[PDB]
Amino acid sequence: GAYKYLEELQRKKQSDVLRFLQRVRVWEYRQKNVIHRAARPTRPDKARRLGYKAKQGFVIYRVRVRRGNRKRNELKYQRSLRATAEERVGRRAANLRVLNSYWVNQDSTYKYFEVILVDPQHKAIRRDARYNWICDPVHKHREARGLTATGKKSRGINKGHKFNNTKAGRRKTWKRQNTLSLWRYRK
Amino acid sequence: VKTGIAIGLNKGKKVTSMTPAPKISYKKGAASNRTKFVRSLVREIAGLSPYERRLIDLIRNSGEKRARKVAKKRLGSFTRAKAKVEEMNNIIAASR
Amino acid sequence: AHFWKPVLNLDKLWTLIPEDKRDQYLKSASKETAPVIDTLAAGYGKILGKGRIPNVPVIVKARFVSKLAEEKIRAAGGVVELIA
Amino acid sequence: EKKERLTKEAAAVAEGKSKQDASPKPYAVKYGLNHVVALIENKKAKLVLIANDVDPIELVVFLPALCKKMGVPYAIVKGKARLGTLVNQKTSAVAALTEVRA
Amino acid sequence: HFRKHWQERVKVHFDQAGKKVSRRNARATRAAKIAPRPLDLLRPVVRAPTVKYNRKVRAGRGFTLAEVKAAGLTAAYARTIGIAVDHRRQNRNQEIFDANVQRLKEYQSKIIVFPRNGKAPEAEQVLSAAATFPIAQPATDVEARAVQDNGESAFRTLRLARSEKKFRGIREKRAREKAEAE
RNA sequence: UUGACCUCAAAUCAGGUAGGAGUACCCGCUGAACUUAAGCAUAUCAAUAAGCGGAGGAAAAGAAACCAACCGGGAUUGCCUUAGUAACGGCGAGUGAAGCGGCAAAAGCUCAAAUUUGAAAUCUGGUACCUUCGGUGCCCGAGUUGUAAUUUGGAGAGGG
RNA sequence: GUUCUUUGUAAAGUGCCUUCGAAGAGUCGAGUUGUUUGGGAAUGCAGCUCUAAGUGGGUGGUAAAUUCCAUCUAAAGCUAA
RNA sequence: UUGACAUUGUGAAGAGACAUAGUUUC
RNA sequence: GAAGACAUUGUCAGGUGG
C-alpha cells in the first residue's frame, strides 16, 4: 500500500516540494472561507488512522484560526487551537459529532486544520457497529467537554505520577482531597 | 543472580528464575526488510532540508564537532544529534 | 518503604512461640531439634540487644542483627541466618 | 456480467460439481492503488499507468521513482477519468496490467 | 486546616448502613441472575512488592497466559469457565508458577461444566470460591531444625558487604588503572 | 461541436437533524476580592463564588508509553490507611500529596498499518412485496484518493 | 421445559517445522515566555521558535557529560458495576 | 521607541570556501 | 493603479514611563 510512502514523506515537512505545496495550499485556504468543506482530504492516511472510513456519513470540514495568545496579551489560552477549531465546527455543524482532528498546514498568522465529522442519524453509521457507539447520546459535542485527543492532553489526562494533580478530573480530585469526610463512628 | 542476603551488589532473596517469553511489545524498532527500502526511497526522493545541507557543508570544511553542536541547538539533545550527524556522514560516504 | 526496620529486643523472643511449644523447647537443650523463629513473618526486621535470655540453643532467622545479639545467641548455642 | 456468471456457475456446481472453476479465468486490469503498489515489489506488473491530474499529489509522486526502482515500465497518462472509463468507476488514478490473453 | 470555606463541602456517611443493604441485595441479585456460578472469578496467589510486604502474598488480578498453557488450556475458554487472566504480568518465579498451576488444576478438578446444548442438571450453587480456594501463605520451615555454625558471626558479613558495595567503583578504578599500565 | 471528470452552487427538492428550558450532581474554558500574613506587596482565601459553553441517569477516567527498584506488582474509580509523612513557602502565617497494603466492584477490547485480486464479496436510498423496532428481489447511486471478511502487539499472518 | 428448522464440504480452537512480524508526526522531545502544582536547579499545561530517530523512543521526583540496568510502547479509539 | 526568529519569493553580477561545476557569506 | 521581501502579522529582549 501507499500508507507508508505517504507517512514517511509527509514527515519531511521542510523539503522543497512540501514547502512548495504548503505555499500553494495556504494561499488557497486563505482565499476560501474560514470554515469550509473539502469533499476529500489532503492527508488521507492521517485521516484513516484516526477513525475515518470513506463511506456515506463521514465528513471533512477544514478550518482556520488566528495565531497568538488571548488578548485581554500575555494570557496564554489553555484551550489548544486544535480544540478551538473543533468547538467551532461542532457549533456550526450541530447535528454532526466530532471524532478527531488534525493539522495540515500553518502560517505566521494562522494555523489550518481539518476535522472529522459523523452524521449518526445516517443509517450506515447506526449499523456497522464499530461506529454505533457515537450515536449513543453521551457523545453530544465531545469537543466542548474535551474528550478528543488534544482535549484529554490539555485536561492533563494520561497515566503517571507526573499527572497526579490531573488524572481523573482535576476538579473531581480537588473536591476529593479538599474535603472533610466524617463517619458515624469517628476515627 | 543474587547473593542470598538483604544487601549486596546483587542483593535480596535468591530463587529459581524462569526467563519468560520475550514479549512482542519490546521489538518495536526491529524495523523490517521493507521499511528500510521505503525510508531510503523517500529520502532520495524528497531530498534534504536546509539545516541538513548546512550540517554536511560544515562537515566538509570546518569539521564535525561544530555540526554536533548545531544539531544539539536545532534539536534539543545530544543522543539524537549524534545519530543524525552519523547518518549524514553515512550518506556522504554512500554518495561515492 | 525502604525504612521498615521495626526492632525486636532479645527479651521478648519466645512469645513468637504461641504458647505451647514454648515449654517443649524450653525443657530442651536440643542442638539437633531447635526451634526456628521468623522475625520477618512476625513483622520484625532487625534484632537489637536489650535482654538476657536462657542458654537454650535456638535458631533465629532475620536480616539485621547487632553484635551483642548474635553473641548472646551463639552463647546459648543458637544461630542467626541472614536471609534477605 | 458477474450475476450472469453466478447464475451460470450455481447450476454448474449443482449439476457438474466443479470447484467453482468451471468458469474460465479472467484477464483484466487491476486498478486499486494499494493493489498496484502491493503488486509492485513483487514485480507482478508489466505496465502501470499514472494520472497527472491529482491535486493530492503526495498520493502519486512516489510512483515513478518506485516503478523505476523495481524496473517496471511506468507511464503517466493524461486524464484520470480516462482511466475510470476502463474500470467502470469515475476515477481510478492508476491502472495496471499483469496477465494478458496471448 | 479550615481557613477555607469547608462548610459547604462535607461528606457524612450516614448511609453506610443503607449502602450495605443495597450492596448485599445486589450481590444476591447478581448471584440469582448468575444462579449456578460462584459470583467470583478464581484469582491467583502473588507475592507482593516493596520489601516491607514481600513476606506476604496477595490475591492478584489474573493468572498468566503461560500458566494457563501449562495447565493445557486457553484464555478464551478460561474466561468462560470462571477464571481470570492478566497478560501484562510475566512469571519469573517457579514456585509461584507451580502454585498457580496447582490452583488451576484444583479448580478444573473441582468444577463441572454444562454443555451449550443443555439438559441443565441440578447444581445447588455456592456463593463464593475465594472461600474454597483460599489464598494460602506458604511454609518456609518446619518448627524444628538442628543448629550449624560457620564462624562468620553474621554481622561482619553485612558490614563488609556494605564496604565492598560502597568502595566497588574505587576498587574497579584501582584495577583498571593498574591494568592499563604500559 | 459533442462528452467523461473535478470543484462550487440553487431548489417550499425526497428523508433526517441541532437549538431552548432544566441545571443538585458531572467535563471544560475564563477567573477576581474582601478576609489572612500585629502592618505590607510575591503568597493565602482559590486553581473557589460569579460569568460562558456541553451532557447523562450517572458523567468523567480506563486495559499502561503505570507504580516500582522489592522473590517485583498489574486497567480505572471510591473508601480506610500511608499522614497531617515526604515536599513546598519573607521553612512565616500556612498549603499539602502519591506507590505499596486491606475492602468494595470486578469485563474486556477495537481501528489504521496485509492484495479478496481466480472476480467489491460491503452500503445508504428509491421502488414492489412481506410474518415489519426489519427481510428478499429490481433499479438510480456512493465507492479503488479503498466498502466487507482477516489481524491489533496479550499477539499475529502467510506456507507445509 | 417445549416445539419447527440444519446449518455444515461454512466457522473456530488445538501442537510441530519454516519465512516475516507492517505497529499512529508540526507529534515526542529541547529552548524561551506566561500560568499552575506539594514538585524544590525548572512537574503539567497553552502560545511562539527549532524539529527528529526506528537493534528506536518515553519514564526512573537534584543538577549536568558519559555508560549500564529495570519497566513500558506514545502521538487514534469504545464500554458495564 | 529600537533589535532578533519566521512569515519570505525569483534574479544578475563582484569578493569569495568547497565537489569545468552545485552547494551558501555578504 | 500604488507598494513589495521592507512593510506587516504572531512571538521575544533594551531606553522612557501616574
Q: What residue spans of chain D are helical by DSSP H?
A: 2-11, 33-39, 62-69, 81-84
Q: Which SS3 state, helix, strand or coil, does residue C5 take?
A: coil
Contact A144, A58 (CB under 8 A): no
Q: Which of D54, D55, D26, D37 is nearest to D95 (CA)?
A: D37
Are the C-beta atoms of residues E46 and E111 closer than 8 Å to each other?
Answer: no
Chain B nearest-CA distance from A58, in A, is 31
Asked whether the beta carbons of D31 and D92 are under 8 A apart, the reply is yes
Decide: helix, strand or coil at residue D47.
Answer: strand
Q: Is B5 on the interface with D (CB under 8 A)?
A: no
Pairing of strands A36-37, A58-66: antiparallel
The Cα C3–Cα E59 span in angstroms is 25
The backbone torsions φ and ψ at residue A42, rounded to the nearest 5 degrees and listed phi first, read -100, 5
Position A186, amino acid: R
Name every chain A residue with its beta carbon within 8 A of the beta carbon of B35. Answer: 4, 8
Q: Which burial class, exposed, middle or buried, applies to E45 when counting CB atoms under 10 A from its CB (0-12, 13-18, 19+)?
A: buried
**HSE on the CB side for E93, CA within 13 Å?**
12
Residue C73 CA to residue E154 CA, distance in Å, equals 11
CB of A177 less than 8 A from some CB of E: no
Spanning CA of D57 to C1' of G48, the rounded length in angstroms is 31
Write out the residue range of the structural domain in which residue A5 sits.
Answer: 1-187
Angle between helices B35-46 and D62-69 (to 10 degrees): 120
Question: What phi and psi values does residue B50 have, to the nearest 5 degrees?
Answer: -60, -40
Chain-centre distance of CA A4, in angstroms? 23
DSSP notation for chain A: --HHHHHHHHT-TTSHHHHHHHHHHHHHHHHS-SSEE-SS-S-HHHHHTTT---STTEEEEEEEEE-S-B----B--SS-HHHHHHHHHHHHS-SSEEEEEEEEEE-SSEEEEEEEEE-TTSHHHHSSTTSTTTTSGGGTTHHHHT-SHHHHHHHT-SSSSSTTSSSS-HHHHHHHHS-EEE-SS--
C-alpha cell at E133: 480456594
Q: Which CATH superfamily is domain B15-96 in?
A: Ribosomal protein L36 (1.10.10.1760)
Long-range contacts for B89-94 (Cβ within 8 Å, ≥24 apart)? B89/B59, B89/B64, B91/B43, B91/B56, B92/B56, B92/B59
Give the list of residues 6+ apart from residue E39 with CB closer than 8 angstroms, or none: E27, E30, E31, E127, E128
3-state class (DSSP) for residue B59: helix
Going by C-alpha positions, the residue among E131, E127, E112, E134 that lies closest to residue E38 is: E127
- Write down the experimental method used for this entry: cryo-EM
Resolution in A: 3.8
B42 and D CB contact within 8 Å: yes
For residue E67, give the nearest of B26, B13, B18 by alpha carbon: B18
Quickly tell me which residue has 521478648 as its cell: C12
Coil/strand/helix, residue C75: helix
3-class DSSP state for residue E154? coil
Q: Which of B5, B11, B13 to mutate to test the interface with C (most CBs of C within 10 A)?
A: B5
- Closest residue by C-alpha to C1' distance, nucleotide G81: E26
Give the number of domains in chain A: 1
CATH number for the domain that contains residue A40: 3.40.1120.10
Cβ–Cβ < 8 Å for A106, A113:
no
**Which of 48-67 (B) contact A at CB < 8 A?**
48-50
In whole angstroms, what is the distance from residue B58 CA to residue B53 CA?
9
Domain positions in chain B are 15-96
